[PDB]
Symmetry: C5
């Protein structure tokens, strides 16, 4: 009669998603529990309510007790898995427990970013038992604590839904072993994005918009050129926040459109300066009044069009 | 009598072509199908129409069934190949199937970029069977779905033609095994290139062109110097989109020519300012009228010359 | 009767804490001492007060003496551990000693930076004996020299508290071995931070503050735009001192707020220039007097609010 | 009687010479030819004029024929060598052939750059046979095609002379094996250098030279400061084309001298502005006339001096 | 009777000292000489004055002669050691020789930079014999050629003193083997530093100093702001020449102080402009005369103070 083991898991943050690296990490907890009568012992010999061991994997205590124990290993791990606060509890009846904080580097496919704020992604963590079916079997999942695992603020990713389930996969020379896979769906956590990149662009565009109120023109033109230089420098300072890809991300569409518009502003300023100096100073005011109300309209139209094209059907 | 197996393949995107790294990746699908009577089974014992297994390579189920199965492995893969949605179907008659999504890191030569938009390149993926000829042989290729594999928008590369075929290569200690090689021809997907690099250069050149309309000269000169600074900064912001090579790419020819022309503009502006302040203000207008129509002509001539030299014979 | 060994340790600096690398290093000393009668020898044969060996680990001299010796190895080391000034002293009575300077690359979890100046962190170094319990056992810890290990100035980290203790962990095929773990708590050593990043920002903000005293407006506006460009460039020059993360660090909050304020300054300057040129030159002075005393107030309020939110309860 | 084999080689381009990496690559061809009567076969059985095999190294066909064959391997290769268009021809008489395109990553010393355009360097490729002397021996070198291997334009390096020769080196447990080493001498291919870095510096220096013609001084001074900023930015944009070294490269001497001269220009402009505003406007013209003819003289003298010091004796 | 061998070494340049990499390289020569009668041979059989072999390590010729030979290997080498011009000479009497140019990648601790021009450092290269004491022993050191090894100009490091000596270290299963360690002391070779970083800063500070001579103020203020921008950009262009560390290097102290002073200059310029426009134009000249002589004094005082604090006692 194979013994039955209950298992739970929880994730506190997921860090380091790189297109080139094709791998990531995860930090969380893990809990194992089962009952085997062979572990039982008389309290008279020990003289203690319970017995415990610290700072050792299941493999080591299994080797030292000379009894089989439910070892495991993550399916796709790379290098080594760090473990702190490892402990294992033994009760006189014969129950057991095991708690471990962990951090694993896992292997991942190549993602398809395209839409940058959207970035709906799937993450999966697989846990496998290193003993055949007859020795031990996963029975039921303990949905303890919060798989969301909110601690403070936010991290590089946020959770939106998840689901754990268990299966059986083939083992060596016949037989099988239990598997326990958790699947996650995540979102880019756009708070940092809106608060760091979009607001400075809004201000830098708005200043170039407002310089049109002037009645002189030379100062207007000088300010326009200076602001275009500042816009180029700002576009640079983002730098490594737009990973080197082949195709276009919506951020890139916005950057290109804003840059073209600012260059148009400087061209219009030169033309207005000449028109004013020639003598037809009346029509310059008309052109100013046209542009003042043309710009916000076109920006709204472009935002709406991009929304329709990239966030719904058709 | 060696059993016969039909195989198909399809590619959805090819990412990460680096001159230094000398390797790339590919993500796609794979399908295998064959028929062996030994797999047959009476429905009375199973009580099911079909039998299936999930999330295991061919090697594992082959080891657990204790029957030979058509395993495989990519010819030049590096590290590990990621697999999702693996499944294998067994029918009571004795047929079989196998579907697997995959992503492989392959080894590649050193390319010769030279012409940057042109970049005609050849990519090849090789699939080999890990069993001798007597056990299994590739028979015919299933041209299923679309080897083009268009999903949405575009990716770092596009497909223009392809061709699959099968051969035989030597195996260990005599005998041979089947091989199935797909060859691709690709193009740089210039849409991102024209929409991100060429249009901003066109605007930045055009503004410096238009400042000549002015009749004052000090403001013209100041604007010219500012625009040359902006052009240098923009040339920088492209940055890592022009990989560090030894030789010249057509983009570099264009950048150098545009920079030289803008420096010429600032020199001409200084000379015109002096000529105007000296007293001969009439000839300055003549020089302006000459330059206004000289520039577009020379740009057209240079574009045509480069086309003739680098895109056809002689 | 297992022989008893006393052990001490000290750390001189800890370098290279990288979020991506997930590892660090440490340089310090180490001392081992114990007594076994078998090592004793008659001074008549040697003719020397003491006997010594140089530049060899414990393993080598243990192999060459053909007597067991207390070897060790760090628990999580990577690659190789560099050793200089290795020496081992043998006294005629039978005592021993061993001194070694060292530098180890250790494995570390993924940290959670969030608050950048705060960065309370935990570092741990584990030393294990490579012989079973019966051969040798750690007895007591020699708290020699200074675990703080102050040498000159400061380094990338500073020490605030520590504690060493010994335990027992399972070994191969039964039995156990001694362990000796030192734990550290560290602080970011904010001196470099305040002296390099904060003072230049204070000056760059202050200059933009002071330009308001002017009575002309065109020069004020030009200076404001120039200063905003300088602020962007300075924000860049810090560059790699703000590691590429997902979330917000308090430095980023400060940068964003300062940038928004400077853009507001340039907008206000344009509006003031128009108001002055229109004819209502009196109210411009009122606006200047308002802003002059509004800015420092808002900066103080923001500093206080951030302190309350991120450095105490609630 | 050891069979005799003739061998040829050719190189089409050499890429990736990095001081830090201490290694490079090479892409070219290779040809092997020899005659052994054991390979002979009667055309009646085959019914074909010749027999061929494709896409396999010599080792594989040697293992499958069960006859010894002249295998080889590059002496210092790293990782794996890529091979395309591999083929081997067998004639009824008993002759043989083998053609292979290849690309190898080789190990290299640390070079001493110093003079950057000069960079005389030595490259060597070694080919070794993996069978003892008795089995096979290199006899004569086939100087086929062009070891220069010019295809189109140029690449990161150019060839100036070469020489191939064969020797014998010790093998395992007595005996020796043939070796075939090709040596190359290369040049930096300065065309890209002169056309991308030197011409923009010439224009940027020339504009600052020409601004002196002016008679006003404020505009002259503003232009001078702007041009010095542009020169700094340009010096940056080269960036990774000047590898991080300790010592000085001739490019660095030129950059430093040009920068110092431009700073001198701005100082002279300030002094001239003050001298003009004081009242002694006559001597300012004399200073202008002095500088106008001083600068080109000093540049010519410096170019000549550097030539004499770093390109000939003494 | 163990044979005696004389050994010499020389170093031509040491390259690649990186704080993060914790390793470096070295390129130099090596010479070995000894005499064993077994190598003797009658000239009648050979018919040659001497016998030689080329391009093979000691191990290979030792394996092929079937006689013991003094092999060696560097103590801390990583990867592979490149060898060119290897040769070994055998004389009829029985003498021997061996010359080899080499380049080795060695392992190194983590250095403590602090003072950047000072950087007194210790480098050590260890050579070990791979045969026990009875076979061969290092006897005396040949101080041939120049351990300084000056060739042309300078390299990333310079030599100031050195000392070689030999010892004995334990070997496998008893016995020992000879060791030969060379120790070096090096200096940063400040010539490049003073000629590339310090002179441009001196000029950039001096121009901002000299602009005070002016009598107008608007132009002075504009120039001051422009020069501060140029100073920021220049501080950037050094970039990777100041490695990312935690603590302060003397270069950083100088940069921060200069930046603060230039910001003070721009503040003073604004205040002077207002004071002049208000009407009290006399005191502005007094302030100019004060600053003109205040600045050089404070710079001299700061240089002296830093010298006293960081280059001597107390």
């Amino acid at each position: 009669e194979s013994d039955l083991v209950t298992v739970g898991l929880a994730v506190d943050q997921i860090v380091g998603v790189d297109q080139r690296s094709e791998n990531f990490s995860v930090v969380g907890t893990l809990k194992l529990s089962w009952h085997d009568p062979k572990l039982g012992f008389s309290p008279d010999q020990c003289g203690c309510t319970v017995k415990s061991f610290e700072d050792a994997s299941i493999r080591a205590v299994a080797g030292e007790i000379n009894l089989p124990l439910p070892s495991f290993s993550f399916y796709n791990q790379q290098g080594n898995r760090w473990s702190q606060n490892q402990v294992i509890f033994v009760t006189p009846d014969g129950r057991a427990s095991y708690f471990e904080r962990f951090t694993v580097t896992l292997q991942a496919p190549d993602f398809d970013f395209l839409a940058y704020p959207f970035d709906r992604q799937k993450f999966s963590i697989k846990v496998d038992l290193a003993v055949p079916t007859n020795m031990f079997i996963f029975n039921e999942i303990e949905r303890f604590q919060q798989v969301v695992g909110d601690q403070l603020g936010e991290e590089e990713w946020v959770v939106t839904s998840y689901s754990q389930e268990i299966t059986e996969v083939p083992f060596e020379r016949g037989s099988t072993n239990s598997r326990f896979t958790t699947t996650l769906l995540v979102k880019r956590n756009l708070e940092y994005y809106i608060l760091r990149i979009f607001v400075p662009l809004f201000l830098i565009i708005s200043v170039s918009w407002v310089i049109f109120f002037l009645k002189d023109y030379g100062r207007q033109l000088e300010v326009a050129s200076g602001n275009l230089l500042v816009f180029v420098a700002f576009n640079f300072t983002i730098s490594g926040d737009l990973p080197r890809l082949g195709y276009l991300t919506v951020l890139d569409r916005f950057m290109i459109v804003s840059f073209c518009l600012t260059a148009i502003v400087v061209l219009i300023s030169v033309c207005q300066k000449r028109l004013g100096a020639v003598g037809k100073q009346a029509v310059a005011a008309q052109i100013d009044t046209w542009v003042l109300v043309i710009y916000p309209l076109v920006y709204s139209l472009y935002i709406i069009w991009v929304y329709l094209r990239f966030f719904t059907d058709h």
